[PDB]
Design a protein that fits this description.
- This is part of a larger assembly, with one copy of chain A (52 residues), two copies of chain B (375 residues), two copies of chain C (31 residues) and two copies of chain D (54 residues).
- Chain A is 94% helix and 0% strand.
- With 52 residues, chain A is mainly alpha-helical.
- By secondary structure, chain B is α+β, with helices and mostly antiparallel strands.
- Chain B folds into four domains: 4-34 and 71-134 and 337-371, ATPase, nucleotide binding domain (Nucleotidyltransferase, domain 5), CATH 3.30.420; 35-68, Actin, Chain A, domain 2 (Roll); 136-181 and 271-332, ATPase, nucleotide binding domain (Nucleotidyltransferase, domain 5, 2-Layer Sandwich), CATH 3.30.420; 182-267, ATPase, substrate binding domain, subdomain 4 (Actin, Chain A, domain 4), CATH 3.90.640.
- Chain B contains 14 helices and 18 strands.
- Chain B has helices at residues 56-60, 79-93, 113-125, 137-145, 182-195, 203-216, 223-230, 253-262, 274-283, 287-294, 309-320, 338-348, 359-365, 370-373; strands spanning 8-12, 16-21, 29-32, 35-38, 53-54, 65-68, 71-72, 75-76, 103-107, 131-136, 150-153, 163-166, 169-170, 238-241, 247-250, 297-299, 329-330, 357-358.
- In chain B, a hairpin with a 7-residue loop joins strand 2 and strand 3 (29-32).
- Chain D is an all-alpha fold and 54 residues long.
- Chain D starts with a helix and ends with a helix.
- In chain D, 50% of the residues are buried.
- Classes of the chains: A mainly alpha (52), B alpha+beta (375), C mainly alpha (31), D mainly alpha (54).
- At the D-E interface, helix 1 of D face helix 1 of E.
- Bound molecules: adenosine-5'-diphosphate (2 copies).
- One adenosine-5'-diphosphate binds at residues 11, 13, 15-16, 156-158, 182, 210, 214, 301-303, 305-306, 336, 339 of chain B.
- One adenosine-5'-diphosphate (ADP) binds at residues 11, 13, 15-16, 137, 154, 156-157, 182, 210, 213-214, 301-303, 305-306, 336, 339 of chain G.
- It is classed as contractile protein/actin binding protein.
């Protein structure tokens, strides 16, 4: 059953690699979007400061 | 004030609670299953005023209270309010100490287990009752009604049980249990009274509608002919006096509320109606069972007290039932009290003494004992 | 990921035992 | 118009604030769900590599 | 002041729609992640239930 | 990290083979 | 869409409808045997909304529909709803009009005659099918499984027929028709779930309980041992998501539902279970038949997909069956779909081209012809 071997490894290797990479790749995108949220917080504070 | 070391009986449901001692033919008193609490800020001081009021106290001072019941469609959730009701009921109204008397409490056999477990547990752990027995309401109904056989329609405030019993045996495969009850009928009546120009919202307003329902509502023998006239003419209208002197006049709405039991769609429920579910409980049973259940449609609980309910139920079943069979409704004066009376009978039967859970057995087994000894 | 690797290993071992079992049964049946 | 625009500006600052919170909640929830979901279920597939061995 | 409140409001409203859009996209990703998580855990639990035995 | 159910029951199927085979061999040796 | 006048094949019972064309290895589409109708008054205008919904349409919009099954306990009673199902089943999804294609439908010898007569009559008089055949589902399961001999225990939605076949011959005196099926297993589960605090009454609630059952329940190999642990520890509990965000936790109830198959008394049936009926179908046959039927117990249809059922049955049957003899179960992944697959195999056999009831024969003989021609 070369197929059980092909599947036992294909399931694990293809997914752990692709999937864990998506976790960390998106974690960085998300962190950057979270920075955008912080920058909006900063933008709101700056607009208020400029207007007294 | 009682003269014997007898068992206590208390049919405490989502509506009202009936209580007295085993061996009598009636409860000493009936109270609403209510614990009340102030919904207003006090201004005067030295006015007494309780944190909570129970039973008659809760209803008597209701003008400034919000009132709640502990039982949700037959299930106890607020066990602390049950404690208040049981304490008052046994200690002040029956004037007994549960510590010195066995106590019998009631519930449908298909009621969620937590209900039977808390009834057994609270009476043993907070009241120290020497013994307990959670009873089957259908059994109690048959014992009060003079039967061993029939379909018990306890059509109460919480749930309609609808269970066939034959020769003292349950026929559980045929219980057409239904989530249609007196508490829904009251809310329905409030909406249709609103349609007529009489809005109701608050607890006091709800108690008033419940009182309107209990005195004015009826089923009738024929809903279509009854509404043809009631919705067209003042001749079938009946007034009710509200406590503030205002008068509410009710027409076909007077029967639309009880009609809901036969027409569940009135409250958004998907159901065949109490008479078809009764019919199916009979039909689901074996051929040699069916004949005896057709002849024995048995009433207990509230809603069985609406004028025309006993007769509409007999007519609905005979209209679905086969010929030859004599279809009969058993609707005794012991209506609404059939379960309390049966409780007295069961608690006192000599053939039931071994069925009581003793405190020692309870303490050794824990709350789960109710399923070993009761049901 | 479905455990197809062992649906397949199961079949292989099932065949191995079924064959050994066929033989156990024959070996006894042969008398 | 200014109070209204200011209400709109403030609305948008608040809406943005609510969404700054909800973007971060989605940034953290998407993060957490991926971090726990691919990390656990992909791990469960790694475990498949071993679970389905034998 | 109106031009600034309106400009800030409309801009901030773009930040509202950008955060909102990103929230919806993160939710679609979360969902997809949840879906894959679910699909994987269930595919494994399914297959495992089928393959608990052997 | 293997699954206990799989590891064990795979061994049980291997055992049906090993045991059936031992039965086959002993039975055949006599029969 | 078809390049030949291939027969259409469909397994359509009290549960689900499986359909595709002869020659495939699977139905192309699977629908529930449901026709849904709104149980509410429309409020908005221009909303579309159908008078009736069929199959998957009926489940998709079920939040406000009452859902009925035209087939109950193995038999079609609502022929009007079946015409709507057959059209959807064969034409809307397969795009094949029966007018130019023979059709093969399923049942069992103890299935009342009207079922076979209406199946044959509807396809000939409403769909103008050129030919019909009614098959025993056991025949089809055995073709799909590569067997001519065995007991097909079909444990379906409304009825279990348990039909023995030997070397391609029916053994009708040994068919054990049992009033226990998946619909009753659903009923049991909602009653036991009620004991845990989760009551299910309406159509939507019923369909949810069937989903809980299909995904969470299992048979296991030894219910007394399974209960000893499941009743003692949370480690065997499983959560199910109700489509409103509530979670229902199910414990030993998780196997007590399918356990009914090994304990029919749970639903009021006078039976020891499906392994007893498998045993009796074999026992009723001459011994030279029995040895091959015991060695080929066959799972088909519904409930065959509960974890542990194929293995539980082999254990339960070998426990009743004589020793020395090998008792074995045939339970491929092509389970539950084996009846449809066998229909494909049978419909397309060159030798089966002489087994079809033609339209001309039907028109001359009338609806009763199926009783003369099928089996
Ligand atoms: N005249 C009446 N007509 C209809 N129902 C009534 C009447 N009087 C009382 N009831 C109803 O009786 C119910 C309470 O009695 P009961 O059913 O014996 O309690 P339990 O459910 O524990 O058995 C309440 O729903 C109340 O509205
Ligand atoms: N995993 C499962 N668990 C429990 N029951 C199942 C499962 N899968 C299928 N069934 C049941 O299959 C039944 C329909 O089966 P079926 O045998 O094809 O009817 P029939 O053959 O008589 O036309 C439904 O009641 C469904 O609940």
């Amino acid at each position: 059953l070369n197929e059980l071997q092909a599947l036992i490894e294909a399931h694990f290797e293809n997914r752990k690699k692709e999937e864990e990479e998506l976790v960390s790749l998106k974690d960085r995108i998300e962190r950057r979007r979270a920075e955008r949220a912080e920058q909006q917080r900063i933008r709101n504070e700056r607009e208020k400061e400029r207007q007294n | 004030d009682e003269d014997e070391t007898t068992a206590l009986v208390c049919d405490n449901g989502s509506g009202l609670v009936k209580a007295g001692f085993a061996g009598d033919d009636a409860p000493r008193a009936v109270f609403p299953s209510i614990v009340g609490r102030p919904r207003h800020q006090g201004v005067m001081v030295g006015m007494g005023q309780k944190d909570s009021y129970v039973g008659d106290e809760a209803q008597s001072k209701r003008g400034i209270l919000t009132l709640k019941y502990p039982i949700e469609h037959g299930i106890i959730t607020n066990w602390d309010d049950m404690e208040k009701i049981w304490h008052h009921t046994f200690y002040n109204e029956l004037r007994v100490a549960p510590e010195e008397h066995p106590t019998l409490l009631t519930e449908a056999p298909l009621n969620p287990k937590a209900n039977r477990e808390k009834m057994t547990q609270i009476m043993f752990e907070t009241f120290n009752v020497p013994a307990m027995y959670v009873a089957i309401q259908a059994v109690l109904s048959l014992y009060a009604s003079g039967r061993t056989t029939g379909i018990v329609l306890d059509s109460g405030d919480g749930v309609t049980h609808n269970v066939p019993i034959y020769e003292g045996y349950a026929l559980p495969h045929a219980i057409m249990r239904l989530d249609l009850a007196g508490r829904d009928l009251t809310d329905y009546l409030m909406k249709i009274l609103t349609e007529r120009g009489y809005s109701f919202v608050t607890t006091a307003e709800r108690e008033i509608v419940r009182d309107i329902k209990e005195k004015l509502c009826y089923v009738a023998l024929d809903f279509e002919n009854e509404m043809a006239t009631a919705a067209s003419s003042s001749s079938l209208e009946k007034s009710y006096e509200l406590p503030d002197g205002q008068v509410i006049t009710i027409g076909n709405e007077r029967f639309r509320c009880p009609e809901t039991l036969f027409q569940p769609s009135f409250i958004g429920m998907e159901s065949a109606g109490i008479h078809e579910t009764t019919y199916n409980s009979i039909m689901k049973c074996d051929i040699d069972i069916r004949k005896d259940l057709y002849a024995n449609n048995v009433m207990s609980g509230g809603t069985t007290m609406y004028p025309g309910i006993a007769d509409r139920m007999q007519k609905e079943i005979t209209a679905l039932a086969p010929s030859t069979m004599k279809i009969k409704i058993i609707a005794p004066p012991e209506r609404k009290y059939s379960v309390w009376i049966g409780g007295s009978i069961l608690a006192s039967l000599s053939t039931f003494q071994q069925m009581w859970i003793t405190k020692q057995e309870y303490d050794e087994a824990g709350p789960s004992i109710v399923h070993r000894k009761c049901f | 990921a479905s455990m197809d690797a062992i649906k397949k290993k199961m079949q292989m071992l099932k065949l191995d035992k079924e064959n050994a079992l066929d033989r156990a049964e024959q070996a006894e049946a042969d008398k | 118009k200014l109070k209204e625009a200011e209400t709109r500006a403030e609305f948008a600052e608040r809406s943005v604030t609510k969404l700054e919170k909800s973007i971060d909640d989605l940034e953290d929830e998407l993060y957490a769900q991926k971090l726990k979901y691919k990390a656990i279920s992909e791990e469960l597939d790694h475990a498949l590599n071993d679970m389905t061995s034998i």
